[PDB]
Design a protein around this ligand. Sequence first.
Ligand code: 9K5
Length: 289
Amino acid sequence: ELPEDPRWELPRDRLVLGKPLGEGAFGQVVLAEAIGLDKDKPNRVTKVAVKMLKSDATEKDLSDLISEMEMMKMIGKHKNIINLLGACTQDGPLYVIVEYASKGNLREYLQARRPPEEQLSSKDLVSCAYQVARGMEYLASKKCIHRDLAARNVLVTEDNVMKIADFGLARDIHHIDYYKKTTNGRLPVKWMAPEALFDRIYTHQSDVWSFGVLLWEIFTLGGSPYPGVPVEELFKLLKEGHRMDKPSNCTNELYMMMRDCWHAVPSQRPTFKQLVEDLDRIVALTSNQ
Ligand SMILES: *S(=O)(=O)c1cccc(C(=O)OC[C@H]2O[C@@H](n3cnc4c(N)ncnc43)[C@H](O)[C@@H]2O)c1
């Protein structure tokens, strides 16, 4: 059995399980309604996402889900990350309950708003980047390295708030399969800094490289990096120092940002604290017209 933790325990009967949002292989995420999540409002329901372990799941799968939950407890709350809201741990299968993001991942959100029901100004796109940088600056401030920052791991709420997700996932790095694709058919190696990819060294500076690729995804409205490039050719591109071309409808100043994220020398990349401040000024100067 699992240890009881009254900071986070929600009685099982206060959770009304709904439809599946999809499955990992370790688990399954469902939409749910939580009744009386706040102590002050016991008669209010809150929509929430609920993680739980699929059927034929092992001890390793369990401990991995537990590690993720414990990490989110230590990291604390921020507007631009997916926050932990409670857990059902006792007398039945483990549920971890987190903030629900109604508008899906940022990649989907962006592709759905491409020119042909809703469109995005240049201010909105820069604001999107500012929010992800903020979440990242917070995460970094609590000593967390994401290791897979990408538009697909950013979620968007009903109020269009960007939230970093999957920042507490268990990795067991160097067991990563470079050939295996996302369900969308893309390859996660295309977001990884060369030091993380060749030498398996992960740092905040490598997450900054990943954030550059994310900026490029945002300004191409959800484009796919290096389309048609398989793993071995990607390796050759990185060795040669190739850098992705500037998206149309991206200012020079934002492209220079991406390129600074993609500095071959990790120490010379900007920090998330620096990116936050620059994006803050750029948002303010960018037209919504
Ligand atoms: S598990 O195996 O560790 C794990 C980890 C991440 C995601 C999943 C999963 O099954 O995702 C399915 C589907 O649901 C979306 N999702 C995940 N969390 C949320 C929240 N908080 N709000 C809205 N949607 C969410 C994922 O993007 C994915 O599309 C399993």
